[PDB]
Amino acid sequence: APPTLWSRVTKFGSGWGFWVSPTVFITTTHVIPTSAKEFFGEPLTSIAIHRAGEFTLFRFSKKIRPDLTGMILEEGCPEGTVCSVLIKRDSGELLPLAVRMGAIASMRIQGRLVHGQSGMLLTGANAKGMDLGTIPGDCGAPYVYKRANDWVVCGVHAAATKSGNTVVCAVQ
Amino acid sequence: PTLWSRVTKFGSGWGFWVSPTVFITTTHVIPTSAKEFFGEPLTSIAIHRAGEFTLFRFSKKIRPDLTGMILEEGCPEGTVCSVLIKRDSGELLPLAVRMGAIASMRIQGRLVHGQSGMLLTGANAKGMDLGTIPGDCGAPYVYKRANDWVVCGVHAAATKSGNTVVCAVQA
Ligand SMILES: O=C(O)Cc1coc2ccccc12
Ligand SMILES: O=C(O)Cc1coc2ccccc12
Numbered sequence A: 001a002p003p004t005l006w007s008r009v010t011k012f013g014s015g016w017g018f019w020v021s022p023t024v025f026i027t028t029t030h031v032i033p034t035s036a037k038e039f040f041g042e043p044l045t046s047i048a049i050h051r052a053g054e055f056t057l058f059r060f061s062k063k064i065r066p067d068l069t070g071m072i073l074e075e076g077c078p079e080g081t082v083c084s085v086l087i088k089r090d091s092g093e094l095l096p097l098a099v100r101m102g103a104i105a106s107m108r109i110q111g112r113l114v115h116g117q118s119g120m121l122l123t124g125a126n127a128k129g130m131d132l133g134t135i136p137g138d139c140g141a142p143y144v145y146k147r148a149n150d151w152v153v154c155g156v157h158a159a160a161t162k163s164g165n166t167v168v169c170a171v172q
Numbered sequence B: 001p002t003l004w005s006r007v008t009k010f011g012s013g014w015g016f017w018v019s020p021t022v023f024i025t026t027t028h029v030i031p032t033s034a035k036e037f038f039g040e041p042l043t044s045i046a047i048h049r050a051g052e053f054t055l056f057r058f059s060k061k062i063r064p065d066l067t068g069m070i071l072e073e074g075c076p077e078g079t080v081c082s083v084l085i086k087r088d089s090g091e092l093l094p095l096a097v098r099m100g101a102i103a104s105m106r107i108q109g110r111l112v113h114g115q116s117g118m119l120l121t122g123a124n125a126k127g128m129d130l131g132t133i134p135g136d137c138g139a140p141y142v143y144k145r146a147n148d149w150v151v152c153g154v155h156a157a158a159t160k161s162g163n164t165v166v167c168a169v170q171a
Helices: none
Strands: A009-012 A015-019 A024-028 A047-052 A055-060 A082-089 A093-109 A112-121 A142-147 A150-160 A166-170 B007-010 B013-017 B022-026 B046-050 B053-057 B080-086 B092-107 B110-119 B140-145 B148-158 B164-168
Touching: A009 A082, A015 A150, A024 A150, A082 A150, A093 A150, A093 A166, A093 B092, A112 A150, B007 B022, B007 B080, B013 B148, B022 B148, B053 B148, B080 B148, B092 B148, B092 B164, B110 B148
Parallel strands: none
Antiparallel strands: A009 A015, A015 A024, A024 A055, A047 A055, A082 A093, A082 A142, A093 A112, A112 A166, A142 A150, A150 A166, B007 B013, B013 B022, B022 B053, B046 B053, B080 B092, B080 B140, B092 B110, B110 B164, B140 B148, B148 B164
């Protein structure tokens, strides 16, 4: 995946977030530190926060990442789209995990109720574990795909089933 | 400890540490001019070649941090393997492959013997991280069976289209 996509993936709370543009940062709601009143040196009063279940978007009133171009954010993707989940792991290793996307779903995972776009890993069989699959520290990582000449971001990593085969992308 | 730490840059491709003393690779990526590998003189290295599969056995522990893994001669038809691809970007690309018959295949002009496979990452990579490239040769084929990782060969060849691959196997 392009270097300019990996540069937008930022360590955040108990996981990750993704810069869509100089002013717009998206993440998974449950990774946000709950008592927090300041982000990138800005008070809450100078930030527009839009929450929909496990999807959260931060819009800043100043340019936090002026090195970046604004890119396209969509509400999930067509069934059958192959996405990459942009996962960073201990030591500058980069894991763009291939996933085939399916329907919008409501599921129960480890007791909690989860809603988003379902998908199935294309990395191997029985993908439980860090080598072929996702771990809790991956939450907030972006789902991206190449559409003709450009790249699209279509959600953030929210959950994976016990077996590891099914994942859920939280969507705008 | 990770499977990924066993995948090592080697010659014009990659190889894989099965144990502290055993390294497997694709025959065509091995340097043809060398006096040593991994600091051990070639004098002290056992080399077992069967077509595009090569195994090295060292006389001392090169990777003492590792346990020995199960190495088999390919896998049952229908097994979904992962090919553990490393790229010089620092990207790690595990790709699902459905394994088929042992065969001699015509792959971009040349005859290659090994276990055929089909990538399961769909129509086209299309500049997405979904297929193999020539620099990936020697990457291992692995699958989980009960509680154990099994390694069953090395990446030898792939078609232009991308979808057919060949896994070179022991013996
Ligand atoms: O490139 C990086 O990963 C580090 C970085 C440098 O200033 C930043 C501001 C916001 C988000 C991330 C960064
Ligand atoms: O080969 C197997 O036993 C399982 C399998 C993996 O990808 C498939 C695609 C279609 C039909 C079957 C399969």
